[PDB]
Design a protein around this ligand. Structure first.
Ligand SMILES: Nc1ncnc2c1ncn2[C@@H]1O[C@H](COP(=O)(O)OP(=O)(O)OP(=O)(O)O)[C@@H](O)[C@H]1O
Ligand SMILES: [Mg+2]
Lengths: 481, 70, 119, 482
């Protein structure tokens, strides 16, 4: 009926972050690992840990049974989604409820309604949330794609219903281009997800991403606990967060919260989440998401607002009435940076390798979500980030100087990292607004940023033991003599 | 499956006591007995030291057998 | 017998056990395979490939159901063996002429003893 | 709470008896063993077993925290002692209660009240026991011991205020010898028990030992489940025990029955227990002691009364009210013969050795409870008992016929045993009932029986290993090839 032992099944940073949350809360904690992770910081931090096996994530972490077997063998009465993998698949919410385990997440309905962002748009139209109007329903076929592009005007955005992470989506400038993007989108979507559901809408030339956190209660309390801005982006991904959301007036923040209240009530929502927006450089709000994972961006809200958000998630999963019931006032400003394994000296091409050195910044005004440690090994077989850097201050100016120093401190060797990109972009002026507007927009890094970086230059053994004839697979290192 | 396993025929240990048992037994377990690089070297083999009558059948059933057996 | 934490365990270790890189298993190049049961092939026939009727277990020939020179057919009763005071019928496996009926009622008989030839 | 797992803090005959009773009750059972006992039957009989280590009882079965650590590691809900060892240690029962475990026995103070033999006589006085007229608090000096004998009349016994086992018991037949006997008995009490304290009693010349076997309820019921005669003895220790008590009249039996009830009701006792009684050579029925446990002799009460007294112990320790409320009636007659590695033909000295053969008797009217089997070994550090043969019939004579068979069927080899003595005594017109009496007495083996029996003619490997928070010694055969 209540949380008592928590298993979190995800790789790296979020596993550490929420195992840390359990360790803080005093919850019993269970990890799981693939073969490259058998000595990872998470497996060595958790109170218990269990092998899923497998060399790379796709061999193992997708298998519901391999999770729930470890859940029932550890006695993890609670399971946490984190972000990625199964964190937002209703198959697993079903499996956890039928197994009788605490899903630390929104209900099967509350995920089903929001895993496809199309359903969030279909709610949003009814909620009167500021759209990128297009059509709320997808158009039927490329014959309509050309007609709607001619009717509404190019550029048009062509998007798979599930294309999240910035890679299932396309944009076209001219009315002759759009049918090839609509075919390309459909066939790549079929290749990645099997499903083919795809929608088309008018593009925005200078939007800016913003989202607001929402917490909601089994006893019906709701709180809009903070705001974040995600404007700095490269290869179309979130990489820097700014919080509370800067360069937005109360006339934006009003609908950013009040449409979130309406849309979460229209979703019947309970549990935690976020509502996400694209705001024009002219300040004009339009939609992107209502979001149900614990966003990886959590540190800057965790520091600007008085909440250990996953501890609050524990209380919400406990069904306790919210002891946070006020829309808060967020302090000052904070920055956060995703510490990617890419070589900024080499066009940000991915860069695997051994983490022969790792030093991440400490002290006042700076925090780390370290998900890797010295002597570890990194590669694209798992999630792309080593860690995250987090910065805060009384205002942007202080958090900016703190960011420049923090990124000059943050040192990693043995593989390339995006840390020198962060140092550069924290120096590049467009990010430093005038006080009423600021100059950074989408594509700004990959169109205006000043690059400066120089290129860097036994197996386990399984033995079977039987106890009264009950099988028990045991594993040891290949030598112990 | 047809391997011969270790059986705990009596008792019901906890997984920690299983781990202790296994780490002890696994580090007690013998090393590379019957080594993989036992070369053949017939230099001065005792069968060549023996006197054999010119007609001794052991020239077939001992000497030649011992040289040719591989 | 092993103690772990003072808990008594009884542990059976295979002789060809190899863990922690150990050698010595199958030392001379032993082959292992499922051993054959101590019975004749049993597919389609055992002794029944021949003419002789043989006793399938130790007992007493309490009834002889044939006489010397009788023609018999497969399935016909040849003798009854009392064993453990159970009565077990021993029956012709083939058609033919009962030849050399070796037993009389009340004789002690052993497994494999030839009772008669169906010839 | 209810028991689910019982640790038996004992060895051999009684550990087997309790592990069996646990399996009957459906309770999981944990054995423990010392270095000499790692292959004793009970270790194999229990559902789990733990090494105590060490090579003597003092290094093993007597260390409180080792047995509590065994209960902690096994998860046993309950602890059952045997006879001896910690079974009557009040402060060990307290340590078990401080561990929160179910002590299968009387409460610490309910023990402590009878553990002191002077407060035991005080309690007998309170309870209005049949009692010898004298009742000294522990004597000041020899001239008071002489004054006691001058008042109560000789023969007089001097008895220590603490201890047991026949150790602290001395008899004076004359007045002039007593002073050295007092000083020596004081020294014996200090040496064995530290307390130089003795009381004095009118001795009974050739007495017969009788007992009440009692089952007593936390909710205040008491049932006198049976009566025994225990009088065939050596060195004041029991060797053959008989039920029912052969030759009391019902007036005396009912006096003993109701006295034992009164003594339990007054002490507040619950659990299994016995009250010891004596009938004098002249027929003076009198109290002797209360034993705060299921006595080892319980089987003849089980066979005559038809009760599983250990399962009653479990019921009481679970706190259930007794099912029996009308005292059971003997449905037959029984004899129990303790078999020991001791040579009756040579003065009952211990004579340990290998039990190279052990053909137990079987068949009609026989029960065997044993701590050894073919290929066992024994040594002087333990009781040198081996087994208890129990024989039963409809009548005393029939049970003697069955005993004259079963004791001849019993074959033991490789060590000396009391079997030839048992075979002799079951043949003795002194021990055969002359209708309504028999001649034996607590001195009879020593003073009357014709004892004509002719005399009888590596270290293991260890490793200390930590596993997470656990510390685990692992110990293994010394030559493990693997
Ligand atoms: N006067 C006596 N008459 C009969 N038996 C006696 C006498 N004195 C001693 N005994 C025997 O010796 C024992 C004397 O010790 P006591 O009764 O105090 O303790 P216990 O029953 O032996 O205790 P434990 O089992 O804890 O060692 C009596 O039980 C009885 O067995
Ligand atoms: Mg006593």
């Amino acid at each position: 009926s209540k949380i008592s032992k928590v298993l979190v099944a995800n790789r790296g940073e979020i596993a550490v972050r929420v195992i840390r949350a359990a360790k803080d809360a005093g919850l019993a904690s269970v990890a799981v690992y693939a073969e490259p992770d058998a000595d990872a910081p998470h497996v060595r931090l958790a109170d218990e840990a269990f092998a899923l096996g497998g060399q790379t994530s796709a061999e193992s972490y997708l298998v519901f049974e391999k999770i729930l077997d470890a859940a029932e063998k550890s006695g993890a009465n609670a399971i946490h989604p984190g972000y990625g993998f199964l964190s937002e698949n209703a198959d697993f919410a079903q499996a956890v409820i039928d197994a009788g385990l605490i899903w630390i997440g929104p209900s099967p309905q509350s995920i089903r309604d929001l895993g496809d962002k199309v359903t969030a748009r279909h709610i949003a139209a009814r909620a009167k949330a500021p759209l990128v109007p297009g059509t709320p329903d997808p158009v039927k076929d490329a014959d309509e794609v050309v007609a709607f592009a001619k009717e509404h005007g190019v550029p048009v955005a062509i998007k798979a219903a599930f294309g999240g992470g910035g890679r299932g989506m396309k944009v076209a400038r001219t009315l002759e281009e759009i049918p090839e993007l609509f075919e390309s989108a459909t066939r790549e979507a079929i290749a990645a997800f099997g499903r083919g559901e795809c929608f088309v809408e008018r593009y925005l030339d200078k939007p800016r991403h913003v989202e607001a956190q929402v917490i909601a209660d089994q006893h019906g309390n709701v709180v809009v606990a903070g705001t974040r801005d995600c404007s700095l982006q490269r290869r179309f991904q979130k990489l820097v967060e700014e919080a509370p959301a800067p360069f937005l007036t109360d006339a934006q923040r009003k609908e950013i919260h009040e449409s979130a209240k309406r849309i979460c009530k229209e979703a019947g929502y309970y549990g935690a989440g976020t509502v996400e927006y694209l705001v024009g450089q002219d300040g004009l709000i339009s939609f992107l998401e209502v979001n149900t994972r614990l966003q990886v961006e959590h540190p800057v809200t965790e520091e600007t607002s008085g909440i250990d958000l996953v501890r609050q998630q524990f209380k919400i999963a406990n069904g306790e009435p919210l002891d946070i019931t006020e829309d808060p006032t967020p302090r000052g400003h904070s920055f956060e940076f995703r510490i990617n394994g890419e070589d900024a000296g080499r066009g940000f091409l991915p860069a695997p390798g051994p983490v022969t050195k790792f030093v991440a910044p400490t002290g006042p005004g700076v925090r780390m979500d370290s998900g890797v440690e010295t002597g570890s090994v990194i590669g694209g077989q798992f999630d792309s980030m080593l860690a995250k850097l987090i910065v805060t201050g009384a205002t942007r100016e202080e958090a900016l100087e703190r960011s420049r120093r923090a990124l000059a401190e943050f040192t990693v060797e043995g593989l390339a990292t995006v840390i020198p990109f962060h140092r550069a972009v924290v120096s590049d002026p467009a990010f430093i607004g005038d006080g009423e507007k600021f100059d950074v927009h989408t594509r700004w890094i990959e169109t205006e940023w000043n690059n400066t970086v120089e290129p860097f230059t036994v197996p386990r053994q399984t033995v079977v033991v039987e106890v009264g004839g009950r099988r028990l697979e045991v594993s040891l290192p290949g030598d112990l003599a | 499956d047809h391997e011969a396993h270790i059986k705990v025929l009596r008792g019901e240990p906890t997984p920690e006591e299983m781990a202790a048992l296994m780490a002890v037994l696994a580090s007690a377990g013998g090393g590379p007995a019957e080594p993989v690089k036992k070369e053949r070297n017939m230099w001065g083999h005792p069968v060549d030291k023996l006197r054999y009558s010119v007609f001794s059948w052991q020239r077939v059933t001992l000497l030649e057998r011992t040289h040719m057996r591989r | 017998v092993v103690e772990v934490g003072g808990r008594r365990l009884e542990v059976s270790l295979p002789g060809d056990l190899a863990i922690g890189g150990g050698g010595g298993a199958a030392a001379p190049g032993v082959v292992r395979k499922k051993p054959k049961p101590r019975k004749r092939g049993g597919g389609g026939a055992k002794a029944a490939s021949g003419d002789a009727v043989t006793a399938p277990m130790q007992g007493t020939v309490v009834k002889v159901a044939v006489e010397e020179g009788q023609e018999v057919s497969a399935g016909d009763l040849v003798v009854v063996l009392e064993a453990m005071k159970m009565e077990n019928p021993v029956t012709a496996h083939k058609d033919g002429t009962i030849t050399g009926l070796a037993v009389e009622a009340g004789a002690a008989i052993t497994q494999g003893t030839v009772i008669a030839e169906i010839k």
